[PDB]
Amino acid sequence: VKELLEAGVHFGHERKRWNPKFARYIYAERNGIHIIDLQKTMEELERTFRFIEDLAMRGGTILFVGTKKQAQDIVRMEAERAGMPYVNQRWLGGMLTNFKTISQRVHRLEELEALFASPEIEERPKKEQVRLKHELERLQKYLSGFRLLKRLPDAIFVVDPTKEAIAVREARKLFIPVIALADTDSDPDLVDYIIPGNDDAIRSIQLILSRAVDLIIQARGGVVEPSPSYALVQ
């Protein structure tokens, strides 16, 4: 049930913080704001959800990335409402390109899982029961959705692409397709598959990013409810 839910509160965004490359996907500057053409969101959306459905039904791996204010949490939900990996707090230098190395973090994080459950559940020179047990905080806080990713992803899905362009950079560096929700902030030409929208409105980020996660499972049956995502939607 799309169409009207788009123009709900999720159509147009920014003003004169713009990229002229995005000139095609705009209805008009009326009122001094940019209002983005909805008809062309839909057009782009099918082409995007097609890519999604196919990658999914061939049993792929989409890596989700949203590290901005209003994405932050809706991402770690819909990522796992889909059993898919995500990056949530901090995109690190070479998650995709130094992968093998950034991976010996995960390697060694769950070597500590193997000391939270151990004959060392209450022992070891007790100023390591923070030093280590607090090292597992950094490892926790960051590698939450990166831990499940075990070989480079098949796509990546970005929420604000100019916000997160150090990711996109590396995607392309490895020919990994890039799906992004983009708005006038941003440069389409290096989004591989484009959801031209509002990068900011939490209503928007939710409406879209969730409905993409219908597909991701409804290409495998057992579709769920309206799903845990209205963090404090107000």
Binding site: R169, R172, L190
Partner: protein, 138 residues
């Protein structure tokens, strides 16, 4: 004043194509029209068509590009890689059939104005004529 119309055109096309535009106006002449047909016929552009713009004749030009591309920098390859004046008002270049250039062992044009009319190099060669060597595209 506008010293070389043909070059201006050759350039308007160079410039537009490099920011991947879809179309380009150029103010209109008959000789300008001609070069554009050879351009169109050899599939460097999609084509052209007259227009009027503010009471006045222009020729809109529909450029053409490759497919979007792989890695970092997905900008298309370009159908017109190289377009370049040769005869110029400050130094005219004329050649006879015997001395007509073979642009890029075959893969290239050399538009070329003769008494039989504006012509590619192979056209001109086969018709057996030479002339003011206008330019070259590859």
């Amino acid at each position: 004043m506008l010293t070389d119309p043909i070059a201006d055109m050759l350039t308007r096309i160079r410039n537009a194509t490099r920011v991947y535009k879809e179309s380009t106006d150029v103010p209109a002449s008959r000789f300008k029209e001609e070069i554009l047909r050879i351009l169109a016929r050899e599939g460097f552009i999609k084509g052209y068509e007259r227009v009027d713009v503010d009471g006045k004749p222009y020729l809109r030009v529909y450029l053409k590009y490759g497919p979007r591309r792989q890695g970092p920098d997905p900008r298309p390859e370009q159908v017109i890689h190289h377009i370049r004046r040769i005869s110029k008002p400050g130094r005219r270049v004329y050649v006879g059939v015997k001395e007509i250039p073979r642009v890029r062992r075959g893969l290239g044009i050399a538009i070329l104005s003769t008494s039989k009319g504006v012509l590619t190099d192979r056209e001109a060669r086969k018709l057996g004529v030479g002339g003011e060597l206008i330019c070259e595209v590859w």
